[PDB]
Design a protein around this ligand. Structure first.
Ligand code: BLA
Length: 600
């Protein structure tokens, strides 16, 4: 309640959802040791008589049987269950699922079907086949929400995406026109506790048939000879926290079906179905919903793989241009930087870029004012894994003097392009509040609170807005690396500008393994000043991906060693080392001396 519920043990509630029946069985004699209150009317045997009876006397299993487990628990899927002690058979056919653990057996039973018609895999396959051919995550998510709304009959279907902090974003939505649109709403991580999140990942599909259900207590409560509560981590009939029930009741929601979106074994988000009237989702439709979630997750991870590859090639194109369009000599490395500005932003997913050249500042995306850009660099200057670049995700938390610049520079990446020079580069990101899709849902601004409520979508949207205030989406170590490797390449080219300029590079490029190595002037390290195509072919990396790299980064192969110190003493003094060692494959390293001429 209020705060303590963040660490509520929602897996041992001692209650179940009354639409089904649960039994706890002793795996050696088959005696029922514990049972839900709903077991007495279903099996037709009084609760007192039932507790201490073998399951074979009260229920019949024509299909799969329970078997003793030793190591990993086994879970038998839902199959036909009959009741021999009933005076009359039940109105609906019942189905049973087994959760077999080494010392305990759990049998959860529910009706085979709803008062609705069953949707099969065959009816779902066009949706599945379509989701697989969708061009974007947004298209795929919208298609699912609409699809799952038609297949299963839900009033609302929403797609959530979790951020790194586990905050939720309603990226897609499908609903009855009359319903309030929550698309574009974000909620804080605290709204779904870590155990709730863990169970959704574990369960795959989780339902709430009737929010206003009368909880069915597990009786006797604690195991008669072990004294432990029933762990319902795998039981789908598991009761829901009275906090969540209060949330849904305020909303008018009477049923929910939540399915996991698991991308690369991790929880990416969820599919949440909300009904405004009771809705039992049978085992067959739950299996279909599961198959729909797997397909959407499959597509996301595919579109996320294509996206990485796209970015990697864009990054390599800006590196290729930085080396080739610098060799013009009479063209500033800050001038072509201004032309590349949209690609510069893409490489680190920046909302804007500011190119510094003394007092001259050139803004490109969504960046603060020139006076605010001056303030940022000037405050950084006065302050004077391993990346040679300053970055922040919340400007006011690190530099409270610049706190008022959080709307357009909540997060930034600062790289001085020569610390000797007043030339630099500032990538910016706006605060998370700025990114709210008001356009995609004009009703969001107009979204009002539930009066008399302790919990609501309005309260949750406010809480999130409060938590992410003055903070940008965090910079990935990937995006962080790209910026340091750009600063390395820019400064290397800016050092190449005044350190022995020659036509020898053009003569070395023409001929066939060949690379020029800069000494580095007793600091940072010895880098690849220039490289040839054959050198990149033997290495495996690209000509622009290899220029700027370290000499130690070449033989990133740990296995050789032996020498290393013999190569380092020729680097630390400026002499020659004709020692052969492998790279990424065994090749000969022929170093010859300000700059070294290496070939392999
Ligand atoms: C003490 C912790 C909790 C607070 C605070 C609270 O508000 N709920 C808490 C506990 C649980 N939440 C669970 C699931 C859940 N909650 C939400 C919250 C929302 N924020 C929004 O803006 C909206 C809608 C616009 C909602 C619905 C959400 C999205 C979820 C995921 C499930 C769903 O979408 O229906 C749970 C798990 C309950 C269970 O047993 O299934 C707990 C315990």
């Amino acid at each position: 309640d209020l705060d303590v519920c963040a660490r509520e043990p929602i897996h041992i509630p001692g209650l179940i959802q009354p639409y089904g029946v649960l039994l706890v069985i002793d795996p050696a004699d088959g005696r029922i040791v514990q049972a839900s209150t709903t077991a007495a009317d279903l099996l037709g045997v009084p609760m007192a008589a039932l507790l201490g009876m073998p399951y074979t006397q009260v229920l019949t299993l024509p299909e799969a049987q329970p078997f003793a487990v030793d190591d990993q628990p086994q879970h038998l899927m839902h199959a036909e269950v009959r009741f021999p002690q009933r005076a009359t058979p039940p109105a609906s056919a019942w189905v049973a699922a087994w959760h077999l653990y080494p010392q305990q057996w759990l049998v959860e039973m529910e009706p085979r079907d709803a008062r609705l018609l069953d949707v099969t895999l065959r009816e779902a396959m066009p949706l599945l086949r379509s989701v697989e051919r969708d061009p974007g995550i947004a298209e795929a998510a919208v298609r699912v929400a609409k699809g799952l709304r038609s297949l299963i009959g839900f009033d609302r279907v929403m797609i959530y995406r979790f951020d790194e902090e586990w905050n939720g974003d309603i990226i897609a939505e499908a609903r009855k026109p009359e319903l309030e649109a929550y698309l574009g709403l974000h909620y804080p991580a605290s709204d779904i506790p870590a155990q709730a999140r863990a169970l959704y990942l574990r369960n795959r599909v989780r339902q709430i048939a009737d929010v206003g259900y009368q909880p069915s207590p597990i009786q006797p409560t604690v195991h008669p000879q072990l004294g432990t509560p029933v762990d319902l981590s795998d039981v789908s009939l598991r009761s829901v926290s009275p906090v969540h029930l209060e949330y849904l009741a305020n909303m008018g929601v009477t049923a929910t079906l939540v399915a996991s979106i698991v991308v690369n074994d991790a929880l990416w988000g969820l599919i949440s179905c909300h009904h405004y009237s009771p809705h039992f989702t049978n085992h067959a439709m739950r299996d279909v919903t599961d198959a729909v979630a797997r397909t959407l997750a499959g597509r996301i991870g595919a579109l996320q793989a294509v996206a990485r590859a796209r970015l990697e090639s864009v990054l390599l194109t800006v590196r290729e241009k930085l080396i080739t369009d610098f060799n013009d000599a009479e063209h500033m490395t800050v001038e072509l930087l201004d032309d590349m500005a949209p690609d510069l932003m893409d490489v680190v997913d920046a909302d804007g870029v500011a190119i510094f050249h003394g007092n001259d500042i050139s803004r490109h995306g969504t960046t603060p004012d020139v006076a605010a850009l001056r303030r940022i660099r000037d405050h950084i200057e006065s302050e004077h894994d391993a990346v040679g670049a300053l970055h922040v995700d919340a400007i006011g938390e690190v530099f409270p003097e610049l706190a008022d610049l959080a709307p357009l520079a909540a997060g930034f990446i600062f790289v001085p392009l020569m610390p000797q020079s007043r030339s630099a580069l500032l990538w910016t990101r706006r605060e998370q509040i700025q990114q709210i899709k008001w356009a995609e849902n004009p009703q969001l601004a107009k979204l009002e609170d539930i009066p008399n409520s302790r919990l609501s979508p309005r309260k949750s949207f406010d809480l999130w807005q409060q938590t992410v205030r003055g903070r940008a989406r965090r910079w990935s170590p990937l995006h962080l690396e790209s910026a340091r490797s750009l600063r390395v390449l820019i400064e290397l080219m800016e050092r190449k500008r005044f350190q022995q300029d020659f036509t020898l590079l053009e003569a070395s490029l023409s001929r066939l393994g060949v690379a020029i190595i800069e000494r580095g002037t007793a600091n940072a390290a010895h880098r690849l000043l220039f490289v040839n195509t054959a050198f990149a072919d033997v290495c495996g990396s690209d000509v622009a991906e290899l220029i700027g790299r370290e000499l130690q980064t070449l033989y990133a192969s740990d296995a050789p060693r032996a020498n290393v110190e013999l190569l380092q003493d020729a680097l630390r003094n400026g002499r020659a080392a004709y020692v052969t060692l492998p790279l990424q494959v065994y090749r000969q390293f022929h170093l010859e001396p300000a700059h070294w001429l290496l070939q392999l």
